[PDB]
């Protein structure tokens, strides 16, 4: 399983500062063993695909569930593919809890994006109240069931565990907390899909991953990489990419 | 009061077909007395502003309420200005009824977009079961109030009445129907805001405007233009632009 780190740039940047960040990534020594994708805001998807070295992937931060139609403010897998991006992030906790996207809806978005030929970074995660109530395993199995049910070919899906209490707060999952649910997810996938899907699907972690804590998280056996938020806007994103080296 | 034709492409297009369309608009003999804007997918806004003639406005179909942050999937007024687009469409019916945007959110996004110096095409419109219950006027005044309370400067606001029973249905309002609620809107404005605002503010109609029914609606006294959807993807858009012709 090739190490995967995506940078989720969320609602950040302008053309000046993202051209500056992209020039850093392009000219930096980045490990050939790491798959790297940047999630630009939709308004700069085209410009990021035009400026980033081809070996770096571009992902869209959200997309809708049909190719075209009367849905003011949305964009589809067809437009993302037209601009030359190869990925879409779906199910992100901000889309679930701030904008109300349900499992049903993430689910049809996953199925439509895959049928259109994109890759899907599918995000699952429990809230703090659910972890303190002890039900982390039920919540996250329910969420990857809703995804897996819509997955035909797993070669294009990367699962991203992003516990909500760790997104943007500074309160990273410890390497043992991350490890435990990542091997439970791997277990879920072996019991419910197959052993072969379980062994090759990257499960990545997200939630306050920095240059200073990444190396200990990547040493864990079932952590296949990261989906980095705030630190992907920074010079230390190169160090996170290079966490196994 | 300058006649205003907005083109809302909704979630349609790709670079080849919007490229065909934009080339027609740049070539067309468009009226000197109309202000035109095109409302392009977020993913094609930079492309649409690069390629469209400078006299034609570009509008974003949605945005959020703060300038930057941890809101995966959103774009901000700062990013839209950065690209050169001068307007945003806020509170479109599809956003309210398919995507749950309440009047409190639309009201906070209007104030933010205006604080950032963009123009806003603020949308309002009743449902058919509300028209038949005899409460159009209380609905659209409720909606307009949620916007007006968040507007410190009206020179950059265009209001768009869009009865939801008329959007993409083909069931367009008669000129008499558009005119009754637009003169009601104007009067609401002169009594709850001011005479100079009411005199000044463009109130435009959308909901199945075609080149076939546009001269009759445009001859109505308080209809200052249109926000057209499906027909703005066709050569027909040029007729609607020129519609007092």
């Amino acid at each position: 399983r090739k190490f995967f780190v995506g940078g989720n740039w969320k609602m950040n940047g302008d053309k000046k500062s993202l051209g500056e960040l992209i020039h850093t990534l392009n000219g930096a020594k980045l490990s050939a063993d790491t798959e790297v994708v940047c999630g630009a805001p939709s308004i700069y998807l085209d410009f990021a695909r035009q400026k980033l070295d081809a070996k770096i992937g571009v992902a869209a931060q959200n997309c809708y569930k049909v190719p075209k139609g009367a849905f003011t403010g949305e964009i589809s897998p067809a437009m993302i593919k037209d601009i030359g991006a190869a990925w879409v992030i779906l199910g992100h906790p901000e889309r679930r809890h701030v904008f109300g996207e349900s499992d049903e809806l993430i689910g049809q978005k996953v199925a439509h994006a895959l049928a259109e030929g994109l890759g899907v970074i599918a995000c699952i995660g429990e809230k703090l109240d659910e972890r303190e109530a002890g039900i982390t395993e039920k919540v996250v199995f329910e969420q990857t069931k809703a995804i897996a049910d819509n997955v035909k070919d797993w070669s294009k899906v990367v699962l991203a565990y992003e516990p909500v209490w760790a997104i943007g707060t500074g309160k990273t999952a410890t390497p043992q907390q991350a490890q435990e649910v990542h091997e439970k997810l791997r277990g879920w996938l072996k019991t419910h899909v197959s052993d072969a899907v379980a062994q090759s699907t990257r499960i990545i972690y997200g939630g306050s991953v920095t240059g200073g804590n990444c190396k200990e998280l990547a040493s864990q056996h079932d952590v296949d990489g990261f989906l980095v938020g705030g630190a992907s806007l920074k010079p230390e994103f190169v160090d996170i990419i290079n966490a196994k080296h």
Side-chain angles (χ1 to χ4, degrees), chain A residues 12-49:
Chain A
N12 299 276
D14 62 355
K15 244 190 186 176
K16 184 95 203 298
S17 70
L18 294 188
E20 285 175 18
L21 221 195
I22 288 177
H23 189 79
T24 294
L25 288 184
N26 284 348
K29 157 45 171 166
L30 263 35
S31 167
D33 308 286
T34 302
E35 190 173 8
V36 188
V37 316
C38 300
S42 59
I43 195 192
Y44 305 117
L45 250 23
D46 192 3
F47 163 86
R49 208 339 115 224

XYZ file of all heavy atoms in Angstrom, chain A residues 12-49:
280
model
N -9.443 28.162 1.447
C -8.247 29.000 1.558
C -7.551 29.247 0.245
O -7.596 28.469 -0.711
C -7.173 28.401 2.537
C -7.686 28.255 3.962
O -7.660 29.202 4.735
N -8.238 27.117 4.364
N -6.964 30.419 0.259
C -6.067 30.945 -0.747
C -6.640 31.929 -1.738
O -7.825 32.215 -1.820
N -5.686 32.453 -2.498
C -5.984 33.229 -3.679
C -4.958 32.792 -4.694
O -4.033 32.039 -4.340
C -5.875 34.718 -3.433
C -4.541 35.320 -3.023
O -3.566 34.626 -2.795
O -4.483 36.537 -2.948
N -5.053 33.323 -5.919
C -4.235 32.854 -6.999
C -2.778 33.165 -6.655
O -1.949 32.283 -6.837
C -4.602 33.538 -8.332
C -5.157 32.598 -9.405
C -5.259 33.284 -10.771
C -5.942 32.389 -11.807
N -6.127 33.069 -13.097
N -2.462 34.343 -6.094
C -1.087 34.698 -5.658
C -0.453 33.677 -4.690
O 0.628 33.136 -4.946
C -1.080 36.071 -4.940
C 0.274 36.632 -4.511
C 0.781 37.569 -5.602
C 2.310 37.755 -5.590
N 2.812 38.360 -4.371
N -1.132 33.382 -3.579
C -0.552 32.552 -2.556
C -0.602 31.084 -2.908
O 0.201 30.324 -2.397
C -1.265 32.806 -1.239
O -2.596 32.315 -1.205
N -1.491 30.631 -3.788
C -1.525 29.232 -4.159
C -0.539 29.004 -5.281
O -0.036 27.895 -5.439
C -2.962 28.819 -4.580
C -4.100 28.827 -3.520
C -5.353 28.208 -4.125
C -3.727 27.998 -2.303
N -0.248 30.004 -6.116
C 0.830 29.860 -7.057
C 2.128 29.738 -6.240
O 2.959 28.891 -6.578
N 2.310 30.538 -5.184
C 3.484 30.455 -4.289
C 3.681 29.101 -3.601
O 4.774 28.542 -3.613
C 3.395 31.579 -3.210
C 3.735 33.004 -3.780
C 3.591 34.279 -2.904
O 3.535 34.189 -1.673
O 3.530 35.384 -3.462
N 2.628 28.532 -3.008
C 2.626 27.202 -2.402
C 2.931 26.111 -3.455
O 3.673 25.141 -3.207
C 1.251 26.950 -1.824
C 0.888 26.294 -0.520
C -0.578 25.952 -0.577
C 1.650 25.015 -0.296
N 2.271 26.165 -4.634
C 2.540 25.215 -5.701
C 3.973 25.276 -6.205
O 4.529 24.210 -6.457
C 1.537 25.488 -6.793
C 0.162 24.973 -6.249
C 1.939 24.847 -8.104
C -1.032 25.210 -7.179
N 4.603 26.460 -6.294
C 5.988 26.549 -6.716
C 6.881 25.851 -5.667
O 7.872 25.229 -6.042
C 6.372 27.994 -6.850
C 7.733 28.147 -7.498
N 8.047 28.061 -8.795
C 8.893 28.430 -6.809
C 9.334 28.288 -8.923
N 9.824 28.504 -7.725
N 6.543 25.889 -4.370
C 7.290 25.184 -3.331
C 7.175 23.684 -3.504
O 8.196 23.027 -3.573
C 6.781 25.575 -1.948
O 7.141 26.932 -1.846
C 7.355 24.804 -0.784
N 5.982 23.132 -3.649
C 5.791 21.738 -3.870
C 6.464 21.198 -5.099
O 7.018 20.093 -5.066
C 4.286 21.427 -3.939
C 3.628 21.517 -2.576
C 2.192 21.122 -2.661
C 4.314 20.528 -1.601
N 6.473 21.990 -6.168
C 7.040 21.510 -7.413
C 8.552 21.310 -7.390
O 9.099 20.379 -8.003
C 6.687 22.491 -8.549
C 5.261 22.427 -9.090
O 4.476 21.514 -8.831
N 4.945 23.429 -9.924
N 9.195 22.271 -6.717
C 10.645 22.334 -6.623
C 11.241 21.633 -5.402
O 12.467 21.611 -5.243
N 10.394 21.009 -4.581
C 10.798 20.315 -3.374
C 11.114 18.865 -3.700
O 10.618 18.354 -4.705
C 9.654 20.369 -2.350
N 11.988 18.221 -2.896
C 12.315 16.816 -3.031
C 11.229 16.080 -2.302
O 11.173 16.098 -1.084
C 13.692 16.461 -2.386
C 13.962 14.984 -1.944
C 13.563 13.857 -2.932
C 14.047 12.462 -2.550
N 13.353 11.454 -3.333
N 10.395 15.397 -3.053
C 9.252 14.669 -2.548
C 9.451 13.209 -2.816
O 9.688 12.850 -3.958
C 7.975 15.113 -3.266
C 7.007 16.148 -2.708
C 7.718 17.234 -1.932
C 6.208 16.704 -3.884
N 9.216 12.371 -1.818
C 9.423 10.943 -1.929
C 8.613 10.278 -3.017
O 7.384 10.391 -3.042
C 9.100 10.283 -0.597
O 8.995 8.859 -0.764
N 9.319 9.514 -3.858
C 8.711 8.747 -4.933
C 7.821 7.644 -4.434
O 7.071 7.045 -5.210
C 9.753 8.093 -5.805
N 7.877 7.375 -3.129
C 7.055 6.337 -2.549
C 5.726 6.840 -2.028
O 4.912 6.025 -1.583
C 7.820 5.656 -1.406
C 9.195 5.210 -1.879
O 9.233 4.216 -2.613
O 10.198 5.876 -1.540
N 5.498 8.153 -2.087
C 4.295 8.774 -1.567
C 3.409 9.241 -2.724
O 3.914 9.913 -3.618
C 4.587 10.036 -0.729
O 5.446 9.680 0.334
C 3.310 10.640 -0.167
N 2.114 8.886 -2.716
C 1.115 9.505 -3.606
C 0.570 10.790 -2.977
O 0.049 10.820 -1.874
C 0.065 8.522 -3.789
C -0.990 8.804 -4.853
C -1.894 7.603 -5.022
O -1.815 6.636 -4.252
O -2.686 7.622 -5.956
N 0.773 11.902 -3.638
C 0.411 13.232 -3.187
C -0.794 13.837 -3.955
O -0.778 13.891 -5.191
C 1.671 14.158 -3.353
C 1.443 15.558 -2.714
C 2.869 13.492 -2.644
N -1.872 14.333 -3.325
C -2.937 15.017 -4.068
C -3.292 16.308 -3.350
O -3.320 16.368 -2.124
C -4.221 14.086 -4.220
C -3.776 12.683 -4.611
C -4.994 13.912 -2.950
N -3.436 17.428 -4.055
C -3.911 18.679 -3.446
C -5.397 18.943 -3.778
O -5.821 18.928 -4.940
C -3.079 19.824 -3.970
S -1.296 19.668 -3.588
N -6.205 19.181 -2.768
C -7.640 19.552 -2.835
C -7.808 21.079 -2.791
O -7.735 21.737 -1.750
N -7.820 21.647 -3.982
C -7.960 23.089 -4.172
C -9.436 23.482 -3.994
O -10.293 22.601 -4.150
C -7.526 23.497 -5.594
N -9.801 24.728 -3.663
C -11.186 25.224 -3.815
C -11.598 25.099 -5.299
O -10.780 25.383 -6.183
C -11.106 26.653 -3.327
C -9.854 26.754 -2.467
C -8.901 25.804 -3.196
N -12.853 24.772 -5.632
C -13.291 24.573 -7.027
C -12.915 25.716 -7.956
O -12.541 25.473 -9.087
C -14.809 24.364 -7.036
O -15.387 25.531 -6.441
N -12.872 26.946 -7.452
C -12.552 28.119 -8.261
C -11.079 28.197 -8.770
O -10.733 28.989 -9.665
C -13.033 29.336 -7.332
C -13.120 30.639 -8.162
C -12.095 29.495 -6.129
C -13.286 31.983 -7.417
N -10.196 27.359 -8.180
C -8.784 27.288 -8.503
C -8.396 25.844 -8.862
O -7.205 25.541 -8.966
C -7.899 27.740 -7.318
C -8.208 29.119 -6.774
C -8.644 29.293 -5.476
C -8.011 30.202 -7.616
C -8.849 30.599 -5.047
C -8.224 31.476 -7.194
C -8.636 31.664 -5.900
O -8.850 32.978 -5.484
N -9.348 24.897 -9.023
C -9.038 23.568 -9.569
C -8.292 23.576 -10.908
O -7.276 22.892 -11.097
C -10.328 22.784 -9.733
C -10.649 21.597 -8.843
C -9.921 21.632 -7.522
C -12.154 21.622 -8.610
N -8.732 24.409 -11.853
C -8.102 24.497 -13.165
C -6.675 25.057 -13.122
O -5.741 24.485 -13.695
C -9.014 25.360 -14.023
C -8.752 25.395 -15.525
O -7.878 24.709 -16.066
O -9.457 26.159 -16.170
N -6.519 26.206 -12.468
C -5.237 26.830 -12.239
C -4.316 25.900 -11.499
O -3.233 25.769 -12.024
C -5.452 28.099 -11.460
C -4.286 28.743 -10.747
C -3.460 29.622 -11.412
C -4.077 28.458 -9.416
C -2.417 30.229 -10.747
C -3.028 29.076 -8.770
C -2.207 29.952 -9.424
N -4.643 25.263 -10.359
C -3.779 24.259 -9.703
C -3.397 23.097 -10.651
O -2.214 22.753 -10.793
C -4.499 23.657 -8.482
N -4.345 22.478 -11.393
C -3.962 21.483 -12.395
C -3.022 22.068 -13.442
O -2.172 21.357 -13.959
C -5.147 20.933 -13.181
C -4.978 19.497 -13.722
C -3.561 18.944 -13.872
N -3.363 17.846 -12.986
C -2.322 17.564 -12.187
N -1.174 18.211 -11.945
N -2.566 16.453 -11.557
